[PDB]
Scaffold this motif. Sequence first.
Motif, PDB file in Angstrom:
ATOM      1  N   UNK A  77       0.786  -1.250   0.000  1.00  0.00           N
ATOM      2  CA  UNK A  77       0.000   0.000   0.000  1.00  0.00           C
ATOM      3  C   UNK A  77       0.814   1.296   0.000  1.00  0.00           C
ATOM      4  N   UNK A  78       0.172   2.386  -0.441  1.00  0.00           N
ATOM      5  CA  UNK A  78       0.695   3.766  -0.424  1.00  0.00           C
ATOM      6  C   UNK A  78      -0.442   4.812  -0.546  1.00  0.00           C
ATOM      7  N   UNK A  79      -0.272   5.994   0.070  1.00  0.00           N
ATOM      8  CA  UNK A  79      -1.226   7.116   0.014  1.00  0.00           C
ATOM      9  C   UNK A  79      -1.310   7.740  -1.390  1.00  0.00           C
ATOM     10  N   UNK A  80      -0.170   8.173  -1.942  1.00  0.00           N
ATOM     11  CA  UNK A  80      -0.100   8.829  -3.251  1.00  0.00           C
ATOM     12  C   UNK A  80      -0.398   7.850  -4.406  1.00  0.00           C
ATOM     13  N   UNK A  81      -1.210   8.290  -5.382  1.00  0.00           N
ATOM     14  CA  UNK A  81      -1.478   7.530  -6.617  1.00  0.00           C
ATOM     15  C   UNK A  81      -0.273   7.468  -7.572  1.00  0.00           C
ATOM     16  N   UNK A  82       0.552   8.519  -7.801  1.00  0.00           N
ATOM     17  CA  UNK A  82       1.801   8.346  -8.540  1.00  0.00           C
ATOM     18  C   UNK A  82       2.801   7.474  -7.768  1.00  0.00           C
ATOM     19  N   UNK A  83       3.497   6.607  -8.507  1.00  0.00           N
ATOM     20  CA  UNK A  83       4.459   5.612  -8.006  1.00  0.00           C
ATOM     21  C   UNK A  83       5.922   5.985  -8.323  1.00  0.00           C
ATOM     22  N   UNK A  84       6.886   5.145  -7.928  1.00  0.00           N
ATOM     23  CA  UNK A  84       8.332   5.413  -8.091  1.00  0.00           C
ATOM     24  C   UNK A  84       9.057   4.563  -9.132  1.00  0.00           C
ATOM     25  N   UNK A 118       8.265  12.217 -10.925  1.00  0.00           N
ATOM     26  CA  UNK A 118       9.404  12.711 -11.698  1.00  0.00           C
ATOM     27  C   UNK A 118      10.458  13.319 -10.750  1.00  0.00           C
ATOM     28  N   UNK A 119      11.560  13.833 -11.307  1.00  0.00           N
ATOM     29  CA  UNK A 119      12.520  14.634 -10.545  1.00  0.00           C
ATOM     30  C   UNK A 119      11.846  15.852  -9.881  1.00  0.00           C
ATOM     31  N   UNK A 120      12.506  16.403  -8.855  1.00  0.00           N
ATOM     32  CA  UNK A 120      12.036  17.483  -7.963  1.00  0.00           C
ATOM     33  C   UNK A 120      10.694  17.256  -7.204  1.00  0.00           C
ATOM     34  N   UNK A 121       9.879  16.248  -7.545  1.00  0.00           N
ATOM     35  CA  UNK A 121       8.708  15.835  -6.737  1.00  0.00           C
ATOM     36  C   UNK A 121       9.121  15.344  -5.335  1.00  0.00           C
ATOM     37  N   UNK A 122      10.342  14.806  -5.214  1.00  0.00           N
ATOM     38  CA  UNK A 122      10.897  14.230  -3.985  1.00  0.00           C
ATOM     39  C   UNK A 122      11.052  15.176  -2.784  1.00  0.00           C
ATOM     40  N   UNK A 123      11.179  16.493  -3.010  1.00  0.00           N
ATOM     41  CA  UNK A 123      11.610  17.440  -1.957  1.00  0.00           C
ATOM     42  C   UNK A 123      10.602  17.672  -0.837  1.00  0.00           C
ATOM     43  N   UNK A 124       9.321  17.346  -1.047  1.00  0.00           N
ATOM     44  CA  UNK A 124       8.314  17.312   0.029  1.00  0.00           C
ATOM     45  C   UNK A 124       8.578  16.191   1.058  1.00  0.00           C
ATOM     46  N   UNK A 125       9.369  15.171   0.684  1.00  0.00           N
ATOM     47  CA  UNK A 125       9.903  14.112   1.559  1.00  0.00           C
ATOM     48  C   UNK A 125      11.332  14.375   2.063  1.00  0.00           C
ATOM     49  N   UNK A 126      11.852  15.605   1.883  1.00  0.00           N
ATOM     50  CA  UNK A 126      13.187  16.101   2.294  1.00  0.00           C
ATOM     51  C   UNK A 126      14.360  15.249   1.766  1.00  0.00           C
ATOM     52  N   UNK A 127      14.372  15.049   0.438  1.00  0.00           N
ATOM     53  CA  UNK A 127      15.375  14.271  -0.321  1.00  0.00           C
ATOM     54  C   UNK A 127      16.140  15.186  -1.303  1.00  0.00           C
ATOM     55  N   UNK A 128      16.989  16.095  -0.816  1.00  0.00           N
ATOM     56  CA  UNK A 128      17.590  17.154  -1.655  1.00  0.00           C
ATOM     57  C   UNK A 128      18.476  16.616  -2.795  1.00  0.00           C
ATOM     58  N   UNK A 129      19.278  15.575  -2.551  1.00  0.00           N
ATOM     59  CA  UNK A 129      20.264  15.071  -3.517  1.00  0.00           C
ATOM     60  C   UNK A 129      19.625  14.584  -4.839  1.00  0.00           C
ATOM     61  N   UNK A 130      20.255  14.894  -5.981  1.00  0.00           N
ATOM     62  CA  UNK A 130      19.870  14.361  -7.299  1.00  0.00           C
ATOM     63  C   UNK A 130      20.446  12.960  -7.503  1.00  0.00           C
ATOM     64  N   UNK A 131      19.747  12.117  -8.253  1.00  0.00           N
ATOM     65  CA  UNK A 131      20.260  10.825  -8.713  1.00  0.00           C
ATOM     66  C   UNK A 131      21.588  10.977  -9.482  1.00  0.00           C
TER      67      UNK A 131
END
Length: 212
Positions: A77-84, A118-131
Motif C-alpha cells: 500500500x501507499x497514500x499517493x497515486x503516482x508511483x516510483x 518525476x525529478x524534484x517531486x521528492x523534496x516534500x519528503x526532504x530528499x535534496x540530492x539528485x540521482x
Amino acid sequence: DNSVDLYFLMGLSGSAQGHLSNVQTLGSDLLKALNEISRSGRIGFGSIVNMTFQHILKLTADSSQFQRELRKQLVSGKLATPKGQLDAVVQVAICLGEIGWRNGTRFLVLVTDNDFHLAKDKTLGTRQNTSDGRCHLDDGMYRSRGEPDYQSVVQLASKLAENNIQPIFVVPSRMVKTYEKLTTFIPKLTIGELSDDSSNVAQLIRNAYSKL
C-alpha cells in the motif's frame, strides 16, 4: 533465433490489486511465447511500488521458475497515486551484474496502473540530492531510494542508450495517453496497453524480435 534478454518490472501498489492477475498472465504468457520464438530468451523479474525497488530474479533460462516467482507476488500500500517505478527503470538499466544483462537485445517491460513521481517531486519528503546514475543494489533493495531522488527524463534517455536497453511502457488504457508523451521525451521506447489480454504487448516484443 538470436539471444534476447527480457526484464519484467511490475508495480506492487494497492491499486495493482485486481490488475495483479493481468500482470501475472502478462509475464507467464510473455515468457512461454518468447521461449517458442527464441532458444535463448533470458527472463528476469523486479518489483516496485515506492517502499523501494526489489530485484527478485536475475535473467534466467528456467521458465517454470519465473512463473512461480511472478505468481507468488502480492501487493502492499501507499497514500499517493503516482508511483516510483522510473527509479527501478534506472537501477535495472545500470545494475548489469545484478540483473544479468548479456550481449543480445535487452527489453525492460515496465508495468504500472498509475502515474509516477518525476525529478524534484521528492523534496516534500526532504530528499535534496539528485540521482547520480550509478548502481546502488545491495541485499536486492535499492538502498539509495532513502537519499537521492527520482531521476530526470534525460537521465533515463542517456543510461538506457549507453547500457543499450529498450523499455516498453506497458500500462492501463486510462493512463496510456500520459506515458506516450514520456515516449516522445525518451526516444526509441514504446508503450503497451495492459489488460486481460497480452496480444498488444507481445506484438511489440515480437515486432522488435523480427528487426534483429
